Structures are given as C-alpha cells and as structure tokens.
C-alpha cells in the first residue's frame with residue numbers, strides 16, 4: 025500500500041455540534057448555546073443569553089449524549105482507526121472560573137473514551153472548539169482578558185491528567201486562525217468569545233485574544249508533556265490556500281501577504297516566535313498588544329508536535345482594490361472567484377488539488393508531521409424509497425481529496441498521520457446552525473425546525489468509506 | 501531622524517575573479533574552466549573547447565586586466581563610497597591544478613594585496629570561494645565535481661583561504677548560484693557550476709544531482725572548518741533567485757509553480773536546514789536516480805548549515821501546465837516557463853520585475869528566517885558615450901532605483917533581515933552567459949570591445965554619481 029500501515033482513518037465532530045444535553049450533568053452555558061439558527065446568506069444571531077422566541081439548534085443537536093454507544097458502534101462498523109471530538113469546556117468547568125472541575129463531566133468523557141477504546145478506536149481530542157463558557161464572556165470578556173489564559177491552562181491540565189493514558193492525540197485550539205477575519209462577528213465570538221461594541225478596533229482586539237490563546241496553547245503543550253511525555257499535542261488551523269489570480273506581480277504579492285497574515289498563528293505554534301511582518305503591521309496600525317517576556321518564553325518552549333488542519337476549499341486573491349498601498353488583506357473584499365473549479369450549493373469552491381498544495385506548503389514551511397482532522401462535503405441529502413441516502417456527490421468529493429493526499433505522501437513525501445472526514449455523523453453546522461447542510465456517512469432524522477425521530481441510518485458513503493479504510497486507501 | 505534601512509547596511513558592488521582579473525597565467529595560475537570558454541552573443545552559445553585552442557577567442561584570458569589595475573579601480577570604489585566589495589578567489593590562483601599538497605604563495609599574496617587595498621579605504625571584502633572557475637585539470641583528470649575526491653580538494657582550498665584571511669574577510673559564501681545547474685538541459689550551468697562535461701548517453705539529470713550533492717557536502721564541510729578557524733566569520737550560501745510565478749489560479753498551474761520552486765531551491769533547504777526535503781528522495785526513486793550518499797554526508801550536511809542566504813536577483817519567471825505527458829509535475833526550465841505578460845524586459849530578454857525582489861525576500865524570510873544578502877543585482881545594456889565623454893545610463897539608474905525601492909519596503913514594512921545590497925558588475929566586465937563586453941553592467945565604463953581592443957581606460961558613467969549619492973544617503977534619496 026501507499027499509506028503507512030498504521031494510518032489514522034477516522035471521523036471528526038465537535039461537542040456542541042452533536043452532543044445535545046446542553047443542560048445535562050450541570051453543563052454550563054457556552055457561547056454555542058446562545059447562537060440561533062440561520063442559513064446560506066443569513067448570519068446566525070448571537071444573543072445576550074438564551075432569549076425567548078429564538079431557536080438554538082445546539083441545545084438539543086442530535087442527542088449524541090444519550091446515543092453515543094450506538095453511534096460509536098457504527099464508527100466501528102466502518103472500522104474507524106480514530107475518532108476526533110472536543111472536550112466541552114462547559115462540561116468540565118460550567119462557568120469557567122471554578123477551582124475544581126465537574127466530575128460528572130469528566131465521567132462522561134471517561135465513558136465516551138472507554139467506548140471507543142473497546143473497538144480499537146483511538147480518541148483524538150480538541151481542547152477548545154467554539155464553546156467556551158458564556159460566563160467567561162460576560163464576566164471577563166473572554167480571551168481579551170489575560171487571566172483567562174490561566175483558566176484555559178487549568179482546564180487543559182485537568183483534562184491531560186484524567187485522560188493521560190487514554191488519549192494519545194491532542195490539539196489545543198480549533199482553527200485558531202478563523203479570527204483572521206475580524207470583519208464579522210462569528211469567528212471572534214467562537215474562536216475567542218469576543219462581543220464587540222461601539223468604537224472598538226475589531227482588529228486590535230482580535231490580535232490580543234489570538235496572542236493570549238497562542239500563549240495559552242504553548243503553556244498547555246508544555247504541561248501536557250510533563251504529565252505524559254508520550255502525548256502528541258498539535259495545533260489546529262483552518263487551511264484555505266490563497267491563490268494569486270494571475271502572474272501579475274501585484275496579485276503574487278497580495279497572495280503571499282494574505283497567506284502570511286492568515287497563517288502567522290502556525291509560525292508561532294511551530295517556530296515559537298512571531299514573524300517580523302506582524303510587528304511591522306502592528307506598528308503601522310498603532311495596534312498595541314500586551315506581550316511579555318514570559319509570553320515570549322512560553323511560546324518558544326511550547327511549540328507543537330504536529331500540525332492538524334481542516335481543508336474544505338481554496339481562495340483566489342488579486343490586487344483589484346486600490347487605496348491599498350501596503351497590501352493589506354481584506355478577507356471580505358480582496359477575494360475573487362476561481363474560474364477553474366466548481367463549488368457547493370453554499371459556494372465552497374471544490375479544489376482537491378489544493379489539498380496537495382496545502383500539504384506541501386505546511387511541509388516546506390514547517391517540516392512537521394501533518395494531520396487532516398477535518399475534510400468534508402456539506403450538501404442537501406434526500407432519502408430514496410429504498411430508505412437510504414445515495415450521496416455519490418459526497419463520495420466523489422471525499423474520494424478526490426483522498427486521491428490527492430495519497431499523491432502528496434507517495435510522490436511528494438509528506439508525513440501525514442491520518443485523515444479524519446468531518447461531521448462523520450449528520451450534525452448541526454457551525455457556520456449556519458443548519459441540519460440541511462449534511463456532512464455525514466450516517467443520516468440523522470432531524471430538520472432545520474428540529475423535527476424528526478433522530479433515528480440514524482447509514483448513507484451510501486458509509487459502506488464506501490468502510491471499504492476505503494479496509495483497503496487502506498487502495499480502494500477509492 | 502533614522503533611515504528606513506539600518507545604519508551599517510552593506511552597500512557595495514560585485515564581480516567574479518575570472519570576468520575582470522586577466523593575468524590568467526600570472527603567478528603560475530592554472531587553466532580554469534572559464535579559460536577554455538570562447539566568446540559568444542545573444543542567441544549564440546559560447547563554445548566549451550577541450551583545452552585552450554589556437555584560433556579561438558577566449559575573452560576571460562585578459563578580461564579588463566583588473567589584476568594590474570586593481571588599486572586605481574578600488575580607488576574608484578572608494579570614491580563612490582562602497583561599504584563592501586564582493587569578488588571571488590580564483591581557485592586556480594591558489595591551486596592551479598586543484599589537487600596540490602601545498603597552495604600557491606603568489607596567488608595568496610595577490611589576494612592579500614587586493615584585500616589590504618580594500619581595507620585601506622574601509623571597504624569590507626565579501627568573498628565567494630567558487631564562482632564558475634574551478635581548475636580545468638579537475639575536469640579532465642577527475643570529472644569535476646562528479647568525483648567524490650573533489651570534495652576534499654575543495655575543502656582544502658576553502659581551508660587555506662579561511663586561514664590566510666581570517667582577520668581580513670568577514671563575509672564568505674561557498675558556491676556561487678549553486679542552483680543554476682537545476683537547468684541541466686543546457687551545457688553552461690553544469691559545466692560552470694560543476695565541471696561536468698557530458699557525452700552522448702549520459703543521464704544529464706542524474707549526473708547533475710550527484711555533483712550538486714557533492715558540492716552541498718563540500719559546502720557544509722567548508723562552513724565547519726571556516727567556523728573552527730574563526731567562529732566570527734559570516735559564511736553563507738549563494739543561490740540564483742528567479743521567483744517562479746504560476747500563470748493563473750488554475751490549481752494545476754499553482755502546483756507546477758510550487759513544485760518548480762521546490763526543484764530549484766532545495767539547495768537552499770539543504771544549506772539552511774541541513775537535510776534534503778523528502779520530495780527529492782521521492783523524485784529520485786521515480787527517476788531511478790542513484791546518488792552516492794553516505795551517513796557521513798548526512799552528518800556533514802546537518803552540521804554545516806549556513807549563517808545567511810546570499811542570492812542574486814535579476815528577474816521573475818512564469819510557469820504553467822501547458823506541457824503534456826507530465827503527470828508527475830516534473831520541472832523543465834527550458835520547456836515549462838512562459839513569458840510574464842505584465843512586465844518589460846532587457847535587450848537580452850531578461851524580464852524586469854522589481855516587485856519580484858520583494859516577493860523573493862519575503863519567501864526566503866518565511867521559509868528560513870535567516871539574514872539575507874542581495875549579492876548580485878544589475879541591468880545589462882548597450883552603453884554609448886556622449887559628447888560630454890560620459891555614458892548617460894538613465895536606463896540603468898532606473899532599473900537599480902526600482903529594485904532598491906522594493907527592497908526598502910521589504911525591510912521597512914515587511915521586516916525582513918537584510919545585510920546589504922551589491923549591484924552586479926559595478927565595473928564593466930566580461931559577461932557570464934555570452935562572454936560579451938557590449939553587455940555592460942557597470943557604474944564605471946571600461947574601454948574594451950568584443951574584438952578585444954580598447955585602451956582599457958576607466959571612466960564614470962552617469963550612474964556612478966547616482967550610486968555614490970544613494971549610498972551617502974543610505975537609500976533616503978533615490
């Protein structure tokens with residue numbers, strides 16, 4: 025085979041997107057519990073707490089909390105070699121600032137992790153995934169507050185210890201670089217728990233939180249390895265490679281400066297220091313960041329073991345916008361459409377070839393092992409009279425990507441730990457809080473009005489993926 | 501009130517021993533590879549003759565007699581106010597055949613006198629150990645750098661120079677533009693980079709990779725002994741940086757660009773990181789290229805990484821996926837590249853893209869986080885002397901000006917770490933590619949034509965006083 029024997033095939037999810045039981049076992053209100061439903065072309069509403077008259081899809085989600093044994097069993101039917109999820113911060117520390125963790129909460133993950141380990145499924149765990157306690161947001165302002173660093177490090181330490189011999193693979197902060205787009209409220213609210221107000225420099229406040237998180241990460245990495253040196257602790261960034269529209273030298277420069285801005289987090293996770301261009305940017309913009317000598321030391325001592333990343337699409341930038349003499353990157357303004365590729369009904373361009381670019385790029389910059397912890401295809405699914413979703417459009421997409429990651433390993437020589445398709449069981453979509461935007465090999469009976477039996481049934485892609493794993497990639 | 505560039509920025513001018521020196525037999529200097537290369541023209545290759553052949557014109561034999569003129573010439577460098585001066589040590593001046601037990605004293609003394617003369621004016625020498633001029637005996641007798649035995653010979657040479665000049669030269673580089681031979685389809689680079697003489701049947705690519713590996717090992721070893729002799733020496737690598745742009749956002753074009761860069765600059769990853777990128781090893785399998793490569797070599801490479809990246813910039817390239825039957829995205833420099841439709845070009849069809857210099861600087865910075873040194877940049881054009889007795893080379897001034905502006909942006913806005921800036925061919929010399937005098941790069945005009953005649957008189961061009969003023973104001977006033 026072309027992939028190494030122990031290659032980690034699996035499937036990915038996040039606590040707040042699937043678990044449900046948002047109030048069970050003392051679980052506290054998380055940022056996710058206050059975001060209402062939306063849709064393609066309509067933003068999710070972020071409320072000042074749980075308001076009457078609103079629908080909050082994450083509250084009940086797909087009730088994985090009461091269903092996990094049945095679902096894990098399916099994951100084992102496909103033959104997962106691993107399973108990625110996050111530990112819900114608000115199940116361990118309801119409000120965030122407690123001196124002691126919620127035991128019921130630790131127990132739930134004990135029970136979940138034991139369940140996977142029965143079938144030989146190695147857990148892969150993300151510490152923060154879009155679900156910090158909503159209390160740290162109201163009470164402290166989220167990761168704008170330096171003291172929240174220690175709250176995260178407490179939470180991580182607790183988690184490392186309880187699971188030091190059950191969980192081999194960890195990631196600190198989910199897609200730490202989504203907030204690179206400070207222009208809208210989603211990323212800053214979910215990466216970082218930032219609610220903006222009048223006169224706030226949104227960009228300035230984003231960089232501070234990002235810095236606190238990068239520093240929280242480096243401290244957590246360090247502490248993990250002390251507890252169990254064998255732990256593998258990685259970072260996690262959303263990779264959307266950014267292509268220059270043409271060989272016009274300005275487009276070229278725009279592309280390079282955009283990548284630099286979108287992925288400086290990686291350089292810090294990896295090299296242990298900020299690149300010079302960020303400081304130059306801050307000076308230019310008069311952005312001041314609370315950045316200490318101790319921070320600088322934590323960052324250099326807390327670099328990651330591998331890079332985990334999501335991949336769904338690629339972008340294209342050009343130099344069309346004038347009044348940009350410094351070549352700033354505006355995610356909401358500088359991006360144009362790639363004429364050479366197709367897209368989803370949500371307009372996420374489909375570019376499997378970009379997965380290979382990405383893998384090569386990470387490899388060339390960083391020379392660390394890599395882990396595709398999210399890749400997937402969100403689409404409308406229908407049920408055929410035969411009772412099964414025939415999702416060949418999903419199979420085609422996953423398929424084309426696998427073929428490219430294999431080329432990268434076999435022809436290019438990148439070290440890739442594994443591959444984890446995203447939303448492996450139908451779940452509440454992050455960007456939209458939509459059920460109708462489905463990603464799973466497994467269909468869950470529930471719609472965007474929250475009606476349905478919630479019964480699960482396999483999709484056409486279920487057996488397909490099963491054969492993929494069993495063939496270790498030789499059968500696409 | 502500070503400048504955008506550091507106060508100790510190393511402004512200077514660059515050349516190579518075999519293109520200006522002459523005295524190609526003086527002091528027992530041996531025949532080098534350049535001494536058997538005839539003169540050419542744009543479109544017409546120089547001829548690589550087997551030995552020095554009667555009835556053939558070899559322009560490097562006399563060049564501009566800098567060997568006799570150096571003192572007055574260095575005086576001109578001082579007049580413009582150079583902070584540094586870059587040249588190479590002619591290998592064949594130290595080891596005429598290359599395999600001697602003991603070095604040549606007269607050759608050593610020459611560079612002693614030359615370096616002394618620079619320092620009399622406060623000009624810091626920047627030295628390149630191998631610059632397209634290895635001993636020709638090593639070609640005929642050993643097969644050049646295709647022979648593991650030449651690693652030793654080179655390191656012995658590096659060692660002698662490091663010793664002799666350990667308190668005179670602070671800035672060194674090992675192999676000039678070591679990556680040119682990435683273009684192995686044509687004879688030039690492989691023969692100048694590496695002393696390779698191909699015959700019918702050769703796997704040109706495979707042989708290039710071997711010589712390159714040996715030079716990379718020889719480079720690591722030189723770095724290590726240089727530092728042992730004096731840990732303060734700055735010893736760098738030297739690569740030709742022609743950045744390679746994808747034609748369009750077609751993913752296939754994007755990938756051709758990334759893979760081309762990977763192919764053309766792996767040299768740098770080795771110099772900097774101290775090991776090969778995996779993609780090379782993978783590539784070598786697909787091609788069944790066998791490279792003689794010991795654990796000892798592994799160790800040397802990993803331990804002799806460089807202090808800084810010296811590079812040359814002249815232009816940007818463009819690539820696309822138009823070529824058929826390339827399912828693995830191999831890179832052929834003579835076939836995959838297309839013209840940039842957005843820029844202008846010199847009379848020798850070199851494209852002018854100063855913004856590409858800024859891209860280059862960020863690329864090195866992003867990949868390697870080392871100090872960079874722009875050690876060659878220049879504009880080759882036809883000069884004519886006006887009635888005031890001076891060449892009015894505004895074209896040159898404009899070219900250099902534009903590049904300098906971009907590099908300032910890289911520093912002042914992008915934060916790259918740049919040690920200095922060395923316009924190439926600061927004095928009119930014999931060109932690499934063509935062995936031409938008419939392709940002038942200089943701030944200083946040398947009266948000598950392509951038929952070998954002229955008084956060899958030196959005189960300032962208009963750019964002379966321009967550069968002087970660029971330096972005096974540390975780039976403030978371009």
Ligand SMILES: O=P(O)(O)OC[C@H]1O[C@@H](OC[C@H]2O[C@@H](O)[C@H](O)[C@@H](O)[C@@H]2O)[C@H](O)[C@@H](O)[C@@H]1O
Pocket residue numbers: 038041154198199202262334336398402446452453454455456461
């Ligand atoms: O549910 P969604 O909206 O389809 O998102 C998919 C899945 O991937 C990750 O985020 C997806 C993307 O959402 C935006 O922030 C940007 O377009 C991208 O940067 C980002 O990758 C999340 O990890 C996950 O929770 C999402 O459900």
Ligand SMILES: O=P(O)(O)OC[C@H]1O[C@@H](OC[C@H]2O[C@@H](O)[C@H](O)[C@@H](O)[C@@H]2O)[C@H](O)[C@@H](O)[C@@H]1O
Pocket residue numbers: 516676677688740812814876880924930931932933934939
């Ligand atoms: O060949 P020229 O006109 O002298 O210009 C090159 C000059 O700078 C450096 O570049 C070498 C060039 O040789 C050509 O054959 C290639 O096509 C170019 O890509 C390459 O840059 C040399 O280091 C120097 O010796 C040359 O004089």
